[PDB]
Design a protein around this ligand. Structure first.
Ligand SMILES: Nc1ncnc2c1ncn2[C@@H]1O[C@H](COP(=O)(O)OP(=O)(O)O)[C@@H](O)[C@H]1O
Ligand SMILES: [Mg+2]
Ligand SMILES: [Mg+2]
Ligand SMILES: [Mg+2]
Ligand SMILES: [Mg+2]
Ligand SMILES: [Mg+2]
Ligand SMILES: [Mg+2]
Ligand SMILES: [Mg+2]
Lengths: 563, 407, 407
């Protein structure tokens, strides 16, 4: 009955009867689509697959359901596409290296056998979001939370080994599974937003001390191509203090998803000793995969993030890159013949971005536990111009700017964080933590910022001889030490890749200790101080084991003999 | 009919511009009308079909003192719970104030902040904006001002599309300072319909005009962020098939912003003191939003990335900032101090510029150089919880002048 | 009906998007379809009336090893003479590779070029672009690379709208180096239909995927010029009444470029190494074409007008250039040399900048200054017919370090 009357890129127009946001199946090959607009008897459909070869003489099928994701055991340590289709299973079914158009598989493995341990008894009353039991998912305690809409008395509840489609309990005559479906465009409910409490520790020094955010916060990472967004996000995905990590590859390179698949199983969590992959979920919609599925991948990853948050866990979502999602919005808007706003983007760009970032936050869950969803969004401004709409809109939504800089990347200073332009609006919520466990880090942080700023002021004068007084040269000296010994961090060195707080704090302390000594000694020249070569030893510290780092610090502390 | 949220296209006999229409689970505002064709903007998420009940009027709110102590959305509907008394209903657009009926502001509201009080004081009934680069503590500045100038006044806070972290920062401070019971808060979320966003400052100012000019009160209105407001206006302007201007913003942006900012001022009966806050997109004051706002408000407090990087709070640029009506409220002594501060700081900054050349030039120019350094360190720099009397601010200036070698 | 070459407007019962239609003396591709209206792009010059035969399918080519040793147009049709075996027909758009099925490139392909091999080595299966200002020897660089990394591999050359001088330069070098028999060449002329231009890289990569992933070969693909490709895409986008983006280029330019560049890589069975070449219009790397390409390829070799003016071939900017996957293939020794070269050259360039001031500054900074001079003269500068082993490149660095006074 329903028929296509037009095909324009990812946009299909069909005559028939439809509902807004209904998932439809387009053409004889039944491509997944979603109704985004209705005008009388016509429906405007964005198709999540390639539309080349589609015909005006073709049917469109109703489903009567919105776009959903299966939430349960089977997500962890696996890679999915923008629609939640498992790429490993696609490979195995097709026996091909290519992604076919129109393939439909269930998200969660239907044959894997799980062990369910109940936490409720028969006759217990249950409400939405309650933990009905737990499943061990390769070392992770997956909490089976009942859907927000289920409530009543447990008439039956089982225990033991089950697959995903099997009934594990019965409430008010309704079967409960190990999984439930949820519309990705719909934010998952909670009880109340909580105050920030605790810093988000990344394992990257510049992000942990200089511009930290709180757990449940959000940050933007804009930069030109080659500035280091992807590596920075992967570093966070590797070492972040978090229960669950969700990496969304939104419109980026296929090899970068493959890289994670290759490396994460070899790496060990510094907090559990378990391999990183077991806490990681990968969502991949590469640059050449269907453009509309980029939007799906963003809402999908957020929804899964909320799901683990609802279990009372801390979650981080890395989105690389949000600009590709913006391109998808612009393309859909263009086909719809909507009037473009600034830079060709639709006028509702800010509102759409907000639908993503407003999902972040620390909350009291429906089951009265505390959970957090932290969101890191990479941005890819054209030509590295930060004044563009995606970057600027994002800055009015997030809690920090982690700005990447061409000039630093140029000279291989990584992370290429611009320490003058970057900011965090959440230092007031995390300074408590650092004060308690490390008294002098607040002063030293201010000191680092003061030196980097002063060095910056001096480099313009330097373009008139490099003639400066010793009281000025000391800022270039200390600035170099902070940049090369603290801010810089090699993601691909076995010792420097991860920086625990102990190492981070100790580095700050030895730099500060060197600083107070050098200042006292101004009134012997700086030329004679630098000759001792203590600065070069400090700079090399970050490359050392840990039980070589501590030894070298002891060695440096004595060598700071101003006697 | 047509649906693409938040927009619906609908057939109506004799459509009224601005007309409120009831649907099953929601309302809409008619934003366009030709013959029997209408375009409407949904109040919120809607998916049902579009059976229509026409109210036969534009959007109005019941005005009373019931709002005081409460939290509401952009439409003036209660979030916390209890509805205010229906009715005494008022057009939320209101009317232009007759300039014959106005009184020019002439009474300084002391903030306790030196960088404001001396050279750029806020006057009762004045409208003055805060311009900020992204990331700078504009919110802390507004709260510190509100804490000191509204001890006796009703505070109305309009949150326009800001994230929860931001509006909760305000709410929590109002609660901790016990100002919450004498405040009315209107919030439109960042992902809300654009119609709710642009109505937010209108319902807040409709209440403000009622409280100030009917109940004879002095009122303080804070609103943030005007850049989000302009974005919502552009969204609506683009849904209407309007011919876009600079950066997609509607041609009437100045006039629309004015229809908000000019709903402030002083009369014989009461006053509305208005502080609109905005983020300057690329830290560019020439961007259309801060530029048009500059042409309307009676001055602005401009925050500085440079001062922020020097760990100076509040990071106020003394020279880019301006209070147009300031002179109306200043004594001859106050005028003298403001002039000496502004002129000497400016000369100090010029001397600073060439100091990245001659290094360290004239004796006279070494005195101004030091003055500017001390102004930033001892005068501008001030704690978030610190209140300085105007006399204390003068004393600091006197002390700095001596340290510098200037008279 | 309508004709304005290369565009025809035509009436079809149930049009198929991308459908190939036969005319008397030529073919066309349906690029738009609403109800029974279609827009089509002619393959070539046509003037006759528009009786239509519908193939009922999108454009496909017969895949085989028959292309090897031959020269073809953008549609894959033979220029030299003999047609390849029909069929085994494949959609020229192909399919996205499953990232689960990929292997990350980790094997260095040595070019023999020091400015590439040390700091920015090319890996097998990598996609890496060459960005050039107009006039610079980008073609010589690509040929020198192809000469050394494809001695054992099939070379596929896609010429997209380049003048005859350019594509004949490639053909003649392949002939003189005896690489022509193990090469497949696809050429669309500068004045050809835009549909032939955008199909050129698609038919070339369809063959490449067949050879690499079905016949288990390592393949090298060279394509030039991507700026001409984007121009053809814009031409088609504008013929469709699409809403233009920056500089008239279509909004989906990134996605379309990616649909080409990402058809490369490494698997257990074989590899496609891809080198797209483009001219940066006003020598501006921030122009939309090099900028989007930069966001997609796994690095780029950037040519420098400054080095060219100093008579340096190849004029590679060591610092603007990048190989993203380089570290995957480098030994610890190789990593050490790359780091020392990049960091010291950069410091040398900074010292050079201030040398137009202090003239000739620090002893340490005089050593870096000399290092950068010698890097350009003895390391980067290299003959078009010269091959340097990686060991030889390391030796040069060692020698320069000594001459400079650095360790
Ligand atoms: N912390 C780091 N340590 C070492 N190398 C880095 C680091 N960050 C970035 N890089 C290097 O910089 C290059 C670009 O990084 P990438 O994340 O791909 O940039 P983007 O995603 O911004 O285009 C890569 O080759 C990578 O090896
Ligand atoms: Mg496996
Ligand atoms: Mg990247
Ligand atoms: Mg978290
Ligand atoms: Mg009434
Ligand atoms: Mg009225
Ligand atoms: Mg066949
Ligand atoms: Mg095929």
């Amino acid at each position: 009955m329903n028929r296509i009357i037009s095909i324009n890129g990812p946009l299909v127009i069909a005559k028939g009867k439809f509902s807004i946001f209904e998932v439809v199946r387009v053409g004889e090959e039944k491509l997944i689509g979603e109704v985004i607009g209705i005008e009388n008897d016509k429906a405007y459909i964005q198709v999540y697959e390639d539309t080349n070869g589609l015909k005006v003489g073709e049917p469109v099928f109703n489903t009567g359901k919105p776009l959903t994701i299966e939430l349960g055991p089977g997500l962890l340590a696996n890679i999915f596409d923008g629609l939640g289709r498992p790429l490993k299973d696609i490979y195995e079914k097709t026996q091909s290296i290519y992604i076919p158009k129109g393939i439909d598989l269930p998200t969660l493995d239907r044959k894997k056998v799980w062990e369910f341990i109940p936490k409720k008894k028969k006759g217990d009353t249950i409400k939405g979001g309650d933990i009905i039991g737990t499943v061990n998912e390769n070392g992770f305690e997956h909490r089976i939370i009942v859907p927000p809409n289920v409530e009543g008395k447990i008439e039956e509840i089982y225990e033991g080994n089950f697959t995903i489609e099997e009934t594990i309990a019965i409430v008010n005559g309704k079967p409960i599974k190990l999984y439930h479906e949820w519309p990705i465009r719909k934010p998952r409910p909670y009880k109340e937003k909580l105050d920030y409490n605790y810093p988000f520790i990344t394992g990257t020094r510049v992000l942990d001390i200089m511009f930290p955010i709180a757990k449940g916060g959000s940050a933007a990472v804009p930069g030109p191509f080659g500035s280091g967004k992807t590596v920075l996000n992967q570093q966070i995905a590797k070492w972040a203090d978090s229960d669950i990590v969700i990496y969304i590859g939104c419109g980026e390179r296929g090899n970068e998803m493959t890289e994670v698949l290759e490396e994460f199983p070899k790496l060990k969590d510094p907090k559990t000793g378990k391999p990183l992959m077991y806490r990681t979920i990968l969502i991949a919609n590469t640059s050449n995969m269907p453009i509309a599925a980029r939007e799906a991948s963003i809402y999908l990853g957020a929804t899964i993030g909320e799901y683990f948050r609802d279990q009372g866990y801390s979650v981080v979502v890395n989105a690389d890159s949000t600009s590709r999602w913006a391109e998808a919005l612009r393309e859909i808007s263009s086909r719809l013949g909507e009037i473009p706003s600034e830079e060709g983007y639709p006028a509702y760009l800010l509102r759409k971005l907000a639908e993503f970032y407003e999902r972040s936050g620390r909350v009291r869950t429906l089951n009265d536990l505390e959970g957090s969803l932290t969101i890191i969004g990479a941005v890819s401004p054209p030509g590295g111009d930060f004044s563009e709409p995606v970057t600027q809109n994002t800055l009015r939504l997030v809690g920090a700017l982690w700005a990447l800089d061409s000039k630093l990347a140029y000279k291989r200073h990584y992370p290429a964080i611009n320490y003058l332009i970057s900011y965090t609006k959440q230092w007031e919520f995390v300074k408590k933590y650092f004060e308690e466990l490390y008294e002098d880090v607040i002063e030293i942080r201010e000191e680092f910022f003061a030196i980097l700023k002063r060095e910056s002021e001096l480099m313009d004068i330097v373009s008139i001889v490099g003639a400066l007084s010793d009281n000025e040269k000391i800022y270039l000296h200390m600035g170099r030490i902070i940049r090369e010994g603290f801010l810089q961090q090699d993601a691909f060195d076995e010792n420097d890749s991860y920086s625990p707080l102990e190492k981070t704090i100790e580095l700050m302390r030895i730099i500060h200790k060197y600083y107070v000594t050098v200042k006292q000694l101004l009134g012997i020249p700086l030329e004679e101080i630098e000759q001792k070569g203590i600065h070069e030893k400090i700079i090399k510290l970050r490359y050392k084991s840990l039980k070589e780092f501590r030894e070298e610090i002891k060695a440096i502390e004595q060598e700071i003999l101003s006697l | 009919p047509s649906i693409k949220p938040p927009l619906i296209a609908v057939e109506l006999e004799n459509p009224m511009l601005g007309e409120v229409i009831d649907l099953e689970e929601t309302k809409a505002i008619v934003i366009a009308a030709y013959e029997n064709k209408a375009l409407a903007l949904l109040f919120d998420y809607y998916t049902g079909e579009i059976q229509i009940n026409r109210q036969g009027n534009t959007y109005k709110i019941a005005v009373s003192e019931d709002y005081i102590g409460g939290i509401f959305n952009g439409f003036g509907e209660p979030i916390k719970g209890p509805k205010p008394y229906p009715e005494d209903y008022r057009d939320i657009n209101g009317l232009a104030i007759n300039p014959y009926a106005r009184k020019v502001p002439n009474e300084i509201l002391y903030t306790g902040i030196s960088s404001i009080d001396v050279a750029h004081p806020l006057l009762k009934g004045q409208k003055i904006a805060i311009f900020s680069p992204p990331g700078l503590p504009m919110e802390r500045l507004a709260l510190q001002i509100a804490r000191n100038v509204a001890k006796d006044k009703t505070i109305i806070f309009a949150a326009i599309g800001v994230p929860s972290d931001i509006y909760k920062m305000f709410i929590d401070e109002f609660i901790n300072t016990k100002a919450i019971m004498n405040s009315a808060i209107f919030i439109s979320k960042a992902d809300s319909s654009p119609i709710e966003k642009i109505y937010t400052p209108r319902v807040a100012l409709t209440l403000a005009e009622y409280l100030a000019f009917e109940k004879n009160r002095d009122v303080l209105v804070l609103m943030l962020d005007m850049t989000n407001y302009a974005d919502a206006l552009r969204e609506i302007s683009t849904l209407r098939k309007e011919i876009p201007s600079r950066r997609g913003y509607p041609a009437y942006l100045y006039t629309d912003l004015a229809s908000i900012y000019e709903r402030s001022g002083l009369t014989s009966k009461g006053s509305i003191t208005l502080i609109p806050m905005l983020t300057m997109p690329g830290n560019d004051i020439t961007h259309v939003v801060p530029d048009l706002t500059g042409y309307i408000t009676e001055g602005q407090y401009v925050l500085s990335q440079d001062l922020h990087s020097k760990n100076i709070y509040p990071p106020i640029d003394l020279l880019k900032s301006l209070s147009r009506l300031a002179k109306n409220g200043m004594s001859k002594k106050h005028k003298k101090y403001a002039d000496i501060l502004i002129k000497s700081y400016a000369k100090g900054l010029e001397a600073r510029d060439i100091a990245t050349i001659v290094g360290e030039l004239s004796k006279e120019d070494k005195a101004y150089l030091k003055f500017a350094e001390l102004v930033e360190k001892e005068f501008i720099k001030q704690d978030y919880y610190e209140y300085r009397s105007i006399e204390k601010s003068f004393e600091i200036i006197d002390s700095i002048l001596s340290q510098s070698g200037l008279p």
